[PDB]
């Protein structure tokens, strides 16, 4: 033919001239037409570099075509000579005649080609297309139907939106109206097999499958084998990388244990017993301490029934501590500290009975909830403030407000009675307590550079624990708002024991806590036990008008008091109100001359063939340290990499009685993630290089840090994160449905969608996954064949080591939180059929394209 409008056709019907996603077309993608023109008269053939946006040629409707013409004429593509002025376009809409819309669009393409010529490139055009697309609901975030759009929405302090999800469903249809994404089909995706619902027949926990990100299908037997690979890797990190050969993790902090198929918890425990013989061997179990993060109390029962392969997280204790001691007003009664925990501590005088557990005053997420509350307070009328309208400047403002408020007596945001919360935590029996980095240090400064105001109080309590805390526990109300928590000492079982250990006489502790700042002054009697008659006690911590004293300076009691002939200690107390105490805090320990360490060895406790973890004096001797904050800043030098600062201070952590060091998730972070902390990772096996460190440092540094912690006598756990990955660079065409956090379809303001092609980011994993994914499966099968013959509960089948995961894609994923791309990107023709490019491996339908690009 002669030259003309037919040159709008695609240069060729394949991937060399039409971008596509598994054969489907996206309205925001570009294509190479055969030719282009600036006036409709002279037409120029296209080089391989001359690509154009599809939104110049096709649209999902007449409405959107009219908006496009309108928008471009109002943003630099006005030309009176081609019938395109602000006046000529002001009234056009979906009901404008078809032939004049097509004419206006053709003339606009000429006007656009003139702009491309003038600007010597498509750079401005590309920005104008992106700016236009953001104003069209079906081509942008709002059509995904966020809960944030609801009238008078209240943002959630968690900073995630639980019900903003989509599931990936099967679709092997031959109907072009439904499309086909069969490469992403699965025989698994068993969702919500969480905690006691592992077998699908007890949802008394109602714990959700979905949190945030791309949710991994931990019911897929190939995925379950890959988790064993990943565990084995981390447990031998340093020697498998050729880095420090003692730079190997000893165990795991298990992220999101309530939100993944519980099979993986059974399987992790099995692996670690195969490798280290933990079951029935407290010394081996305790050397490989592992503990599960969760806020559902039903996990205690689950873990007991399983023989306790990991520690239960006692969140009840945290909420009790905050409700009793931490509020400004409407404090719960002091007695709740006795009863409202997974362990009742009224008179706790036995061992191997309580649910093995870990407890805390603060963790990284709880500090975040406070900071996000503050952000929401500071910037009301911004409903999506916790989603896409979040700005780091709001966090900075909140942190400045927090540090100021933390120093006040009348705190508006920060917790009251932080020292007393710790005094209870670190004296409690039948728990492994967990101290938070950000309660010892100002967590937004460079790593460990600024001590927190609570550093002195908490570190005093930490050292005394190692020296003194052992034996039975009794907690007793002395009045309606004040309590004494007493430990009787190593080898002292209860208040009536004489003591059976050489350290019995000189160990034990009394912690006095009240939560009424107006409490009248009075005397109180504390029962130290029969092993502690006529004995001198030191005033470790007492309260003063302005704070705490560590040497009985200007407090109600002197530096030493002595018990009577029955073991009763007599003490004076009253209510105070200062930045450290709202109520009262007192701590008493026996006076001693030298060093003392009351740790009980695991070789000396009762072994039980059916238990891994047992709550006894040996396990109680452990203390966990959370080494990070979400708001930890990017380092300013190699010397300030957390890993190097940590290695340098190894002896400090040992001196504070820390036995188990919880290291942040060390994985390569998604660069655009909110915090760059490691839970939003793109590569599960790359833990940073010298050229490209993570927030915390390089892999080589990590291995040296672990070795240095081992040299100081500590064991080290890695935060293992099976639930989600975030930041995949590869898009895939998936078939999806709008759901809540359990994968059940919902409506949002009366609207919904189901079985729709969505161009989600799903594919990636980095070179770490390529190299290390499944690498160790052959050897694990050779050494521990039972791992791949034991039928898992949720599926009834063993993990499958015959397939290696070198690259993640949707077939291994349950779904995703909303990705802010739009549900209408997928090109449909007028009749509703999906457009499709039959090329290469994409054979699902015959090539079918819009008529505008022939």
Ligand X SMILES: OC[C@H]1O[C@H](OC[C@H]2O[C@H](O[C@H]3[C@H](O)[C@@H](O)[C@@H](O[C@H]4[C@H](O)[C@@H](O)[C@@H](O[C@H]5[C@H](O)[C@@H](O)[C@@H](O)O[C@@H]5CO)O[C@@H]4CO)O[C@@H]3CO)[C@H](O)[C@@H](O)[C@@H]2O)[C@H](O)[C@@H](O)[C@@H]1O
Ligand Y SMILES: OC[C@H]1O[C@@H](O)[C@H](O)[C@@H](O)[C@@H]1O
Would you say 128 or 215 has its CB closer to ligand X?
Answer: 215
Binding partner at 310 among ligand X, Ca ion, ligand Y, none, C-beta below 5 to 8 Å by kind: none
Write down the residue that tokens 């340290």 correspond to. 625
> Shortest approach of ligand X to residue 365 CB, angstroms?
5
Report if residue 71 touches ligand X, rule: CB under 6 A. Answer: no
The answer to whether 723 is a known ligand-binding residue is yes
Sequence-ordered list of residues with C-beta below 8 angstroms from that of 392, at least 6 positions apart, any chain: none
Q: How far apart are CA 733 and CA 168, in angstroms?
A: 10
> Shortest approach of Ca ion to residue 734 CB, angstroms?
17
Instruction: Return the biggest CA–CA distance within the chain.
Output: 115
Of the ranges 231-239, 252-260, 487-495, 705-713, which one interacts with Ca ion (CB under 5 A)? Answer: 252-260
- Closest by CA to 624, choosing from 354, 320, 283, 358, is 358
Cβ–Cβ contacts within 10 Å for residue 53, how many? 21
> Shortest approach of ligand Y to residue 52 CB, angstroms?
8
Would you say 36 or 515 has its CB closer to ligand Y?
Answer: 36
DSSP-based three-state secondary structure for 834:
strand
Report if residue 31 touches ligand Y, rule: CB under 6 A. Answer: no
First to last CA, the chain: 15
Number of residues located near Ca ion, criterion CB under 5 A: 4
The count of C-alpha atoms lying within 13 angstroms of the C-alpha of 603, restricted to the half-sphere facing its C-beta, is 0
Binding partner at 209 among ligand Y, ligand X, Ca ion, none, C-beta below 5 to 8 Å by kind: Ca ion
Q: How far apart are CA 766 and CA 686, in angstroms?
A: 8
Binding partner at 412 among ligand Y, ligand X, Ca ion, none, C-beta below 5 to 8 Å by kind: none
Would you say 69 or 212 has its CB closer to ligand X?
Answer: 212
- Closest by CA to 494, choosing from 522, 520, 469, 530, is 530
Binding partner at 49 among ligand Y, Ca ion, ligand X, none, C-beta below 5 to 8 Å by kind: ligand Y
Question: Kind and range of the H or E element at 36?
Answer: strand 35-37
Residues in the chain: 854
For residue 616, what are the CA distances in angstroms to 198, 474, 500, 607, 624?
28, 16, 16, 10, 16
Binding partner at 819 among ligand X, ligand Y, Ca ion, none, C-beta below 5 to 8 Å by kind: ligand X
Contact pick of 576, 679, 759, 836 for ligand X (by CB under 6 A) = 679
DSSP-based three-state secondary structure for 40:
coil
- Closest by CA to 487, choosing from 502, 500, 506, is 506
Would you say 276 or 761 has its CB closer to ligand X?
Answer: 761
Q: How far apart are CA 33 and CA 15, in angstroms?
A: 13
The answer to whether 209 is a known ligand-binding residue is yes
DSSP-based three-state secondary structure for 754:
coil
Report if residue 383 touches ligand X, rule: CB under 6 A. Answer: no
Phi-psi region of 796 (alpha: psi -120 to 50; beta: other; left: phi over 0): left
Report if residue 816 touches ligand X, rule: CB under 6 A. Answer: yes
The answer to whether 215 is a known ligand-binding residue is yes
Would you say 48 or 520 has its CB closer to ligand Y?
Answer: 48
Of the ranges 86-94, 295-303, 516-524, 811-819, which one interacts with ligand X (CB under 6 A)? Answer: 811-819
Report if residue 672 touches ligand X, rule: CB under 6 A. Answer: yes
Q: How far apart are CA 40 and CA 6, in angstroms?
A: 11
Would you say 28 or 163 has its CB closer to ligand Y?
Answer: 28
Report if residue 691 touches ligand Y, rule: CB under 6 A. Answer: no
Number of residues located near ligand Y, criterion CB under 6 A: 3
φ, ψ (nearest 5 deg) of residue 778: -60, -45
Report if residue 217 touches Ca ion, rule: CB under 5 A. Answer: no
Would you say 30 or 399 has its CB closer to ligand Y?
Answer: 30
Report if residue 259 touches Ca ion, rule: CB under 5 A. Answer: yes
Contact pick of 247, 635, 727, 799 for ligand X (by CB under 6 A) = 727
Report if residue 120 touches ligand Y, rule: CB under 6 A. Answer: no
Contact pick of 244, 817, 822, 823 for ligand X (by CB under 6 A) = 817
> Shortest approach of ligand Y to residue 117 CB, angstroms?
16
Q: How far apart are CA 379 and CA 836, in angstroms?
A: 45
Q: Which of residues 106-165 bind Ca ion (CB under 5 A)?
A: none
Contact present, 850 and 56 (Cβ < 8 Å): no
Contact present, 309 and 303 (Cβ < 8 Å): yes
Q: How far apart are CA 824 and CA 838, in angstroms?
A: 21
Would you say 51 or 812 has its CB closer to ligand Y?
Answer: 51
Sequence-ordered list of residues with C-beta below 8 angstroms from that of 501, at least 6 positions apart, any chain: 489, 490, 491, 492
Q: Which of residues 193-222 bind ligand X (CB under 6 A)?
A: 212-214
Would you say 713 or 840 has its CB closer to ligand Y?
Answer: 840
Contact pick of 27, 34, 43, 51 for ligand Y (by CB under 6 A) = 51
- Closest by CA to 233, choosing from 567, 683, 793, 731, is 683
Binding partner at 51 among ligand Y, ligand X, Ca ion, none, C-beta below 5 to 8 Å by kind: ligand Y
Q: How far apart are CA 212 and CA 164, in angstroms?
A: 8
For the chain, counts of helices (H) and of strands (E): 22, 31
> Shortest approach of ligand X to residue 818 CB, angstroms?
6
Binding partner at 322 among ligand X, ligand Y, Ca ion, none, C-beta below 5 to 8 Å by kind: none
Contact pick of 237, 249, 441, 728 for ligand X (by CB under 6 A) = 728
Q: What would the two tokens of residue 194 be?
A: 């969480």
> Shortest approach of Ca ion to residue 681 CB, angstroms?
15
Q: What would the two tokens of residue 371 be?
A: 């900071």
φ, ψ (nearest 5 deg) of residue 437: -45, -45
Q: Which of residues 687-706 bind Ca ion (CB under 5 A)?
A: none
Of the ranges 77-85, 91-99, 422-430, 814-822, which one interacts with ligand X (CB under 6 A)? Answer: 814-822
Report if residue 809 touches ligand X, rule: CB under 6 A. Answer: no
> Shortest approach of ligand X to residue 571 CB, angstroms?
42
Contact pick of 175, 365, 407, 597 for ligand X (by CB under 6 A) = 365
Binding partner at 215 among Ca ion, ligand Y, ligand X, none, C-beta below 5 to 8 Å by kind: Ca ion
Write down the residue that tokens 């892999």 correspond to. 699
> Shortest approach of Ca ion to residue 192 CB, angstroms?
9
Encoded one letter per residue, x for contact with ligand X by CB under 6 A and - for no contact, window 156-175 reads ---xx---------------
Which residues make beta-bridge pairs with 357?
A: 312
Would you say 30 or 761 has its CB closer to ligand Y?
Answer: 30
> Shortest approach of ligand X to residue 26 CB, angstroms?
13
Contact present, 602 and 616 (Cβ < 8 Å): no
- Closest by CA to 243, choosing from 702, 715, 647, 688, is 702
Report if residue 30 touches ligand Y, rule: CB under 6 A. Answer: yes
φ, ψ (nearest 5 deg) of residue 398: -60, -40
Report if residue 49 touches ligand Y, rule: CB under 6 A. Answer: yes
DSSP-based three-state secondary structure for 827:
coil
Q: How far apart are CA 820 and CA 757, in angstroms?
A: 15
> Shortest approach of ligand Y to residue 851 CB, angstroms?
23
Report if residue 215 touches Ca ion, rule: CB under 5 A. Answer: yes
Q: 467-491 burial by CB neighbour count: b if 16+ within 10 A, else e?
A: bbbbbbbbbbebeebbbbbbbbbbb
Ordered alpha helix ranges (H), 86-122: 86-89, 98-119
Would you say 125 or 792 has its CB closer to ligand Y?
Answer: 125
Would you say 156 or 274 has its CB closer to ligand X?
Answer: 156
Binding residues: 209, 215, 259, 723
Q: What residues make contact with ligand Y under the rule CB under 6 A?
A: 30, 49, 51
Q: What residues make contact with ligand X under the rule CB under 6 A?
A: 159-160, 212-214, 365, 368, 672-675, 677, 679-680, 726-729, 761, 816-819
Binding residues for Ca(2+): 209, 215, 259, 723
Q: What residues make contact with Ca ion under the rule CB under 5 A?
A: 209, 215, 259, 723
């Amino acid at each position: 033919m002669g030259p003309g409008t037919w040159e709008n056709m695609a240069f060729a019907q394949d991937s060399s001239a039409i971008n596509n996603i598994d054969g489907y077309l996206s309205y925001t993608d570009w294509y190479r037409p055969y030719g282009t023109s600036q006036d409709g008269k002279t037409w120029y053939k296209t080089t391989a570099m001359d690509w154009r946006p599809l939104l110049m040629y096709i649209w999902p409707s007449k409405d959107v075509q009219a908006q496009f013409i309108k928008y471009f004429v109002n943003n630099g593509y006005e030309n009176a000579n081609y019938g395109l002025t602000k006046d000529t376009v002001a009234n056009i809409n979906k009901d404008t005649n078809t032939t004049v819309l097509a004419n206006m669009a053709q003339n606009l393409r000429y006007v656009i080609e003139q702009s491309i010529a003038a600007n010597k490139g498509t750079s401005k055009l590309a920005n104008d297309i992106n700016s236009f697309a953001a104003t069209v609901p079906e081509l942008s975030a709002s059509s995904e139907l966020s809960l944030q759009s609801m009238p008078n929405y209240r943002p959630d302090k968690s900073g995630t939106i639980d019900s903003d999800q989509v599931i990936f469903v099967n679709n092997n249809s031959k109907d072009p109206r439904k499309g086909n994404t069969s490469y992403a089909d699965s025989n698994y995706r068993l969702m919500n097999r969480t905690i006691n619902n592992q077998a699908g027949n007890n949802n008394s926990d109602n714990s959700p499958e979905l949190l945030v990100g791309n949710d991994i299908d931990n019911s897929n037997p190939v995925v379950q084998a890959e988790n064993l690979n990943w565990e084995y890797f981390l447990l031998n990190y340093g020697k498998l990388m050729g880095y420090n050969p003692d730079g190997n993790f000893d165990g795991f902090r298990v992220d999101a244990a309530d939100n993944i198929d519980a099979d993986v918890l059974d399987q992790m425990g099995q692996l670690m017993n195969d490798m280290y013989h933990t079951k029935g061997n407290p010394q081996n179990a305790n050397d490989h301490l592992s503990y599960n993060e969760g806020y559902h109390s039903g996990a205690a029962q689950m873990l007991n029934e399983k023989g306790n392969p990991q520690l239960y997280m006692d969140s009840g204790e945290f909420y009790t501590l905050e409700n009793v001691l931490g509020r400004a007003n409407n404090r719960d009664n002091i007695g709740n500290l006795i009863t409202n925990s997974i362990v009742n501590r009224q008179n706790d005088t036995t061992e191997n009975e309580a649910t093995p557990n870990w407890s805390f005053v603060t963790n990284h997420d709880q500090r975040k909830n406070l900071i996000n509350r503050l952000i929401i307070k500071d910037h009301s009328n911004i409903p999506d403030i916790m989603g896409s309208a979040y700005k780091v400047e709001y966090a900075n403002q909140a942190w400045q407000e927090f540090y100021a408020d933390q120093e006040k007596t009348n705190k508006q945001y920060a917790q009251y009675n932080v020292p007393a919360q710790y005094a209870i935590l670190l004296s409690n029996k039948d728990t492994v307590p967990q101290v938070y980095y950000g309660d010892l240090y100002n967590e937004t400064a460079q790593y460990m550079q600024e001590k927190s105001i609570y550093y002195d109080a908490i570190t005093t309590l930490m050292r005394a624990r190692k020296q003194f805390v052992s034996g039975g526990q009794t907690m007793t109300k002395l009045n309606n708002n004040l309590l004494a928590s007493v430990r009787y000492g190593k080898g002292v079982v209860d208040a009536n024991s004489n003591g059976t250990d050489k350290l019995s006489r000189t160990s034990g502790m009394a912690v006095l806590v009240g939560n009424d700042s107006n409490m009248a002054q009075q005397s109180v009697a504390i029962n130290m036990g029969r092993a502690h008659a006529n004995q001198q006690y030191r005033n470790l911590i007492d309260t003063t008008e302005n704070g705490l004293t560590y040497d009985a300076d200007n407090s109600e009691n002197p530096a030493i008091l002595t018990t009577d002939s029955n073991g009763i200690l007599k003490v004076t107390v009253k209510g105070y109100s200062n930045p450290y105490v709202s109520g009262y805090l007192g701590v008493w320990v026996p006076v001693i001359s030298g060093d003392q360490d009351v740790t009980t060895n695991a070789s000396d406790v009762v072994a039980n063939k059916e238990k891994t973890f047992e709550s006894n004096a040996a396990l109680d001797s452990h203390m966990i340290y959370e080494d990070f904050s979400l708001f930890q800043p990017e380092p300013t030098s190699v010397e300030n990499h957390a890993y190097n600062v940590i290695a340098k201070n190894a002896s400090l952590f040992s001196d504070l009685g820390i036995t188990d060091f919880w290291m942040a998730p060390a994985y390569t972070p998604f660069g655009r993630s909110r915090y760059n902390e490691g839970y939003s990772m793109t590569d599960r096996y790359n833990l940073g290089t010298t050229a490209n460190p993570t927030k915390y440092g390089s892999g080589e540094e990590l291995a040296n840090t672990i070795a240095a912690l081992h040299k100081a006598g500590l064991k080290v756990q890695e935060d293992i994160v099976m639930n989600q990955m975030i930041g995949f660079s590869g898009q895939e065409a998936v078939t999806v449905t709008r759901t809540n956090n359990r994968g059940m379809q919902i409506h949002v303001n009366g609207q919904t969608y189901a079985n729709q092609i969505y161009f989600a980011y799903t594919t990636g994993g980095g070179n770490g996954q390529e190299t290390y994914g499944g690498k160790y499966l052959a050897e694990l099968q050779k050494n521990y064949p039972d791992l791949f013959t034991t039928k898992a509960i949720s599926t009834g089948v063993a993990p499958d080591p015959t397939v290696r995961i070198n690259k993640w894609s949707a077939k291994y994923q349950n779904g995703t939180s909303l990705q802010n791309i739009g549900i209408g990107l997928a090109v449909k023709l007028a009749n509703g059929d999906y457009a499709y490019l039959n090329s290469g491996d994409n054979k699902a339908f015959n090539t079918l394209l819009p008529t505008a690009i022939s």
